[PDB]
Scaffold this active site. Structure first.
Site, PDB file in Angstrom:
ATOM      1  CG  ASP A 112      -0.652   3.937  -8.893  1.00 52.51           C
ATOM      2  OD1 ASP A 112      -0.200   3.728  -7.749  1.00 52.51           O
ATOM      3  OD2 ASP A 112      -0.146   4.782  -9.685  1.00 52.51           O
ATOM      4  CB  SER A 124       4.436   3.047  10.176  1.00 57.93           C
ATOM      5  OG  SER A 124       4.869   1.903  10.895  1.00 57.93           O
TER       6      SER A 124
END
EC number: 3.4.23.22
Length: 330
Positions: A35, A199
């Protein structure tokens, strides 16, 4: 040193991925959920409330000649999905794909919430975010990657998740045969303890690319792609019959659909998530309403590039003094 381990979907939907981990001496092998969105390595154990274990493999510290109670230490964690676990802490030897760390904090669950009990395939989590998020108290403990990174040939790990197939987590090297083209690297902020990046935008199917900055985290521990509601609405608007259902808790779409792809920007480069990756199947057995793999982050507080996005790329988690993230197509 290096390490290399196969990670395998836990079900036909890729809801999560498990990677075998050797704990203790002699080794006890558990299948852990790696994770990058948390920083605790915790395991179901001999100490876990018996009614809260239902098929998982347990770590029994009393059988490990290298286990040592970390005196006074406790841990307690709650995840974005509402689930949670807590317990005490042992140090022990932990190996992943041939890479060994001695003195790793292994957090032994005394309690786990129902979602963990109900998932027999996951014996624990191995956290790969920054150690600043580790919950152990009163002495915070380091992640496996942190502990290993000085010994690694290069201070990096890589996540190559498969679509309906096994994939690989590598530690200490970049497998140049695992991806196509070049790796595009992008800046990371560690201020919230996550692998947080920005992004550069997105496209829906064959549509034109929208340049817009989208801050979010690279989280292998989250199944789906959570993005701002404007982005998600533009995506599902291209799927006839798609709708956000409050009763179901997200966007659903007619199982008869063909989904469009979704492209996300990494600097000047582009990662394409094929439409099939966005189908998470019937909301209930036999239903003709399917759950979507792109969902709104509006209720979270942070955008999450989870498995739906990461499995479309070869992802480099660079833990150099100034961390960065790298994305390649594959």
């Amino acid at each position: 040193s290096t390490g290399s381990a196969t990670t395998t979907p836990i079900d036909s939907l890729d809801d999560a991925y498990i990677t075998p981990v050797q704990i203790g001496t002699p080794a006890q092998t558990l299948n852990l959920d790696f994770d990058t969105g948390s920083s605790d390595l915790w395991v179901f154990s001999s100490e876990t409330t018996a009614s809260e274990v239902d098929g998982q493999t347990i770590y029994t510290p009393s059988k490990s000649t290298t286990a040592k109670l970390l005196s006074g230490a406790t841990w307690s964690i709650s995840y974005g999905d509402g689930s949670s676990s807590s317990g005490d802490v042992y140090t022990d030897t932990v190996s992943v794909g041939g890479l060994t760390v001695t003195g790793q904090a292994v957090e032994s669950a005394k309690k786990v919430s129902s979602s963990f009990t109900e998932d027999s395939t996951i014996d624990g989590l191995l956290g790969l975010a920054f150690s600043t998020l580790n919950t152990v108290s009163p002495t915070q403990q380091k992640t496996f990657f942190d502990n290993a990174k000085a010994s690694l040939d290069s201070p990096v790990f890589t996540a190559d998740l498969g679509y309906h197939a096994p994939g690989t987590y590598n530690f200490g090297f970049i497998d140049t045969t695992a991806y196509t083209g070049s790796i595009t690297y992008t800046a990371v902020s560690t201020k919230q303890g996550f692998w947080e990046w920005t992004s550069t935008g997105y496209a829906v199917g064959s549509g034109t690319f929208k340049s817009t900055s989208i801050d979010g985290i690279a989280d292998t521990g989250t199944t789906l792609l959570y993005l701002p509601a404007t982005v998600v609405s533009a995506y599902w608007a291209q799927v006839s019959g798609a709708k956000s259902s409050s009763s179901v808790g997200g966007y659903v779409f007619p199982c008869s659909a063909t989904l469009p792809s979704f492209t996300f920007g990494v600097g000047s480069a582009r990662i394409v998530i094929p439409g099939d990756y966005i189908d998470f199947g019937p909301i209930s057995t036999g239903s003709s309403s399917c759950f979507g793999g792109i969902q709104s982050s509006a209720g979270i507080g942070i955008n999450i590039f989870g498995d739906v996005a990461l499995k479309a790329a070869f992802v480099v988690f660079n833990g150099a003094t100034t961390p960065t993230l790298g994305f390649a197509s594959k």
